[PDB]
Design a protein around this ligand. Structure first.
Ligand SMILES: Nc1ncnc2c1ncn2[C@@H]1O[C@H](CO)[C@@H](O)[C@H]1OP(=O)(O)O
Ligand SMILES: Nc1ncnc2c1ncn2[C@@H]1O[C@H](CO)[C@@H](O)[C@H]1OP(=O)(O)O
Lengths: 473, 473
């Protein structure tokens, strides 16, 4: 009994987190499967720190103060269960296991119940910000068994990133899967935000003909307006960056976007629960499309585009319009993001604090921005808000951005620039805005070809079946 | 031994199919869980037919000739397994169970293996066309254990719908889940096609101001061009239809589109396998959006649209442009549809005949059209075709439709008409066409914030990690 908490997982993320913990005055007993890495760590990155290193799970379990708090930061699916397998022999009733890997929300749900059943408090939390984030201030998103929360509270919130008015970007999210689900809606939104920038970039590059210096300059001006955000910032950096030969490196790298499943999963949940999260879906699908790199080289030789009409208009005005389109669209993506969180709250019965979450994403994580701030006080102003687009700030920000957004999409469309996410955003906006949508023809068709029944507009609730076929005959 | 085949499931679909079978000279032993319905059937719809009716599963099993062929048309998930449970006691090695319900492709895979294991040949087939389809000519899509196929061959293909040059719209699709998967990609495409028409309809209604008579007239002209298809045909009918008070009924019915999971599932599979099936996804999401009927009535009061600019242009030209937009988009949806089938062929290792499938969808089913014909001889012309957009017919049909399609989307966008599917279609087309897409910035960002590595454009295969952060400092 001396180590406050133990962490199993000596990858960069685990090391940088153990280190941040130590720096906040917590003694950490490090453990890892290939126990050599523990020794390596102790001699190297952890030399001179207060950290203890175990060489067996039972040693690690002995070094702990009660209630035993151990953390699993094992990149995993299977591997987490196996560790849980091992640990429960060794644990007293009331001991805590936190799982920091980006797990599947349902696995977390399962695990939490099972361990609760065997007296152990399980919490799964999303950790975000990468390795430099892990080191000095991660967003942390904990969920599972709330009994554990006062016991891990101090650590989690001390190592958490802290926003301007000193609050940690870490607070308990909710029951069983809540943290892990919140975590993966986050990565979904992250996918959305990067595709929106790729599109803004494609429009400046092919329609406006800007070279990468001017383009980087534009991204920098943008990081000083409503778009003050980490991804706009590093984008200006990436565009500026010059290689060993002094030429820009972005033109050099292969356009096949990789994935590690979390964004895919956000889109799949929307589909399962019937939540119209369209930009994230479009984003996952735009990464799928770039993977067909060979196929597009082939299609370009054969499929033809619109007649080339040079951009005839002011470049500065257009650069403005793209700013406004990227922003109005970002709003729609986030609005859809929290509709997902909302529906899952009804689905699994969790009382999520949407402003709490907005705040946990305001610092630490890759999607940090001034923007999550305005989202947070939309939900402070009204925590029962049904949809972000109805909060006056956003309601007005979109209303203002509106014909710049339409003018950016019309030119892109004319010019042949692929804009999946920019167009879904307009399509969702106009969809949601309309109190009468042609979905009644879907319904009339379905009652016709497949006997499905339909409701009248006045008298919701009663279902009718008209015999269309022949109106006599 | 007298009944050629047995069918368990006396719903309208089961009755109309038993009846079609009888008419092709096959003695059918009908069975159903609530055995009263068998008696009801025999006295009523089946009076004077050659059909036999059982009153117990073991009686039904006795009435059968060997190899025993029984059909499950039980609307189900669970219920099918339970019947399989019952039936295997009663069956000899080599007996066949066909499952006609719209099952989950993975359940079918499972079931096929398990029964193959116990000597029984399982085949799951999609059945399509509804009850009037079932009666006189269903599309049938069989998959599972090919040993069973010569034994059910005659029945299935005799009752199948037959296309102009006399071939049945039924041929063996492939192993284990192939039939059931082909079936559900079909319903996905069906979703796509109806949303595209709702959009064409929304543009004629709000931009062009056409009343439902003229609108119906337009749909009828369209069913006489490249768009000769059953859904264009019944749409003209639905628009014309007048209620008991002599006013049009479509304006009367509630715009909240229902779902029964199959379209949802197509979109989810695309996401799981990384296949960019975007219109179907947009379609499922446009039905999700209409379900939020109360929410849109609320949003309409608060969210504002573009400045109302009257349509200033020729109505007839625009009606043309919408024809061309609906068509170019339909092409992109189908092209994506078969990319899904293709990837599943690589995924589960089935040798699907894409022209075979195109043909099975050419008659019978709700998506029947002259269009599936041209798709079929694209794949006859080249069965190794990687993507429908590369077949000269389509390659040219899109090239022709192209600035009508762009002009329809630009006006819709300006006017505020929600067009999810029409815009994804342009976005996928321009995406696929481009041999260089901004996905390299996604990659550069990911190597920066999350150490993910990237390939150079020349030298695919080697992965680099640049330390961006500071280029010195
Ligand atoms: N199957 C497994 N069982 C337990 N831990 C594992 C594991 N697979 C991966 N991990 C751990 O996940 C962490 C990050 O990938 C590593 O510490 C790794 O342990 P290792 O050091 O033994 O590779
Ligand atoms: N749980 C169940 N077990 C077996 N058959 C079922 C069933 N649930 C639904 N079905 C059958 O599915 C068919 C179409 O819905 C019906 O014939 C129905 O039988 P029923 O006639 O007894 O309702």
């Amino acid at each position: 009994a001396q180590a406050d908490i133990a962490l199993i997982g000596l990858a960069v993320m685990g090391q940088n987190l153990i280190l941040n913990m130590n720096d906040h005055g917590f003694v950490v007993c490090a453990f890892n499967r290939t126990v050599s890495k523990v020794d390596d760590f102790l001699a190297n990155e952890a030399k001179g720190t207060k950290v203890l290193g175990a060489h067996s799970l039972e040693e690690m379990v002995s070094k702990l103060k009660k209630p035993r708090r151990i953390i699993l930061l094992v990149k995993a699916g299977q591997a987490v269960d196996n560790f849980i397998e091992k640990l429960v022999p060794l644990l007293d009733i009331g001991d805590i296991i936190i799982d920091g890997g980006n797990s599947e929300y349902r696995d977390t749900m399962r695990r939490c119940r099972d361990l609760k059943d065997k007296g152990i408090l399980f919490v799964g939390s999303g950790v975000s910000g990468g390795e430099d984030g892990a080191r000095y201030g991660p967003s942390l998103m904990p969920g599972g068994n709330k009994e554990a929360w006062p016991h891990i509270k101090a650590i989690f919130q001390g190592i958490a990133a802290k926003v301007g008015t000193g609050e940690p970007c870490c607070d308990w999210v909710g029951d069983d899967g809540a943290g892990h689900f919140v975590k993966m809606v986050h990565n979904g939104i992250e996918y959305g935000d990067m595709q929106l920038i790729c599109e803004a970039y494609h429009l400046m590059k092919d329609v406006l003909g800007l070279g990468h210096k001017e383009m980087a300059k534009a991204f920098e001006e943008w990081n000083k307006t409503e778009l003050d955000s980490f991804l706009i910032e590093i984008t200006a950096s990436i565009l500026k960056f010059q290689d060993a030969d002094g030429k820009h490196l972005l033109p050099k790298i292969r356009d096949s976007a990789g994935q590690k499943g979390t964004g895919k999963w956000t889109a799949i949940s929307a589909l399962e629960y019937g939540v119209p999260v369209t930009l994230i879906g479009e984003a996952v699908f735009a990464r799928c499309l770039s993977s067909l790199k060979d196929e597009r080289i082939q299609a370009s030789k054969k499929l033809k585009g619109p007649q080339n009409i040079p951009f005839e208009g002011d470049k500065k005005s257009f650069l403005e319009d793209i700013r406004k389109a990227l922003y109005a669209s970002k709003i729609i993506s986030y609005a859809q993001g929290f509709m997902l969180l909302r529906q899952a709250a009804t689905e699994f019965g969790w009382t999520l604090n949407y402003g709490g979450i907005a705040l946990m994403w305001r610092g630490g994580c890759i999607i940090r921005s001034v923007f999550l701030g305005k989202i947070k006080d939309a939900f402070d102003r009204n925590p029962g808000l049904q949809n972000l687009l109805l909060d006056d700030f956003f309601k007005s920000a979109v209303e203002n951005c509106q014909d710049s957004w339409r003018r950016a999409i019309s030119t892109g469309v004319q010019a042949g620039i692929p804009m999946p996410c920019f167009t879904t955003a307009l399509s969702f906006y106009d969809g949601y805005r309309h109190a009468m949508l042609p979905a009644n023809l879907i319904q009339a068709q379905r009652d016709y070809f497949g006997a499905h029944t339909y409701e009248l507009l006045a008298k919701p609730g009663q279902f009718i079946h008209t015999n269309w076929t022949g109106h006599g005959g």
